[model samples]
Target: NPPTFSPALLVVTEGDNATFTCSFSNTSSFVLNWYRMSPSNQTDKLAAFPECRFRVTQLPNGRDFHMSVVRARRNDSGTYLCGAISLAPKLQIKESLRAELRVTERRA
Candidate 1:
């Protein structure tokens, strides 16, 4: 089975963190990739994001993959996704899921 994503939608204050999580009934043999598609002019592919802000962690249970953005900025608002690549399995449509994260300007 593909990974199951949680909190399909998210909204946050500009200075707050945004958290995204996925649970894959898969293994370490599988490679997981995290991505964000921003609506602004920023064009990029990542595993290359500023590690100071973007974070992804896998729990010891070998399933949950948690991603986060610290003190998220407005441009961080976008449709985010997770890709699970399993080389050992001859498969279906491939493994993937999309999640949204919205960041609003905080009160000054």
Candidate 2:
């Protein structure tokens, strides 16, 4: 099963910054990894395959997240995936989340 984040789906405008976060309940020798899925449906391994990007910020155990500054672009819009991996009977623990960025010149 895939993990889910609270308040999922972050919306940001061009030049704005945004942070996407995910957390876990059980942390018994579990490993986590984060990935970016492009609009092409191709999964481009980020940071290191199987390993989430090195967090520049600090996070408490059982909780993890990734941040992406929105420079807003046409290609910046897509679904992002956050996965958890474990060597338990589950083979691998996995979770996914989505974020869509829309670039517009109109201001609300």
Clashes of each: 0, 2
lDDT, candidate 2, 1-108, per-residue tens: 465653456666655555666555564556555556766765554442223322323265535555454455544556666666677666665666655444444365
With a 3 Å backbone cut-off (N, CA, C), the pairs that clash in candidate 2 are: 3-95, 84-93
Error of 2 at 61 (Å): 5.5
Work out the TM-score per prediction.
0.79, 0.63
Alpha-carbon local distance difference test for all models: 0.70, 0.53
lDDT of 1 by residue, 1-108 (tens): 777666889999999988888777754356666766555465344441112787778878767877788889988888877667666755333345677788888767
- The local lDDT score (0 to 100) that residue 102 gets in candidate 2 is 47
Candidate 2, residue 39: Cα displacement in angstroms equals: 0.4
Poorest 10 consecutive residues of model 2 by lDDT? Answer: 49-58
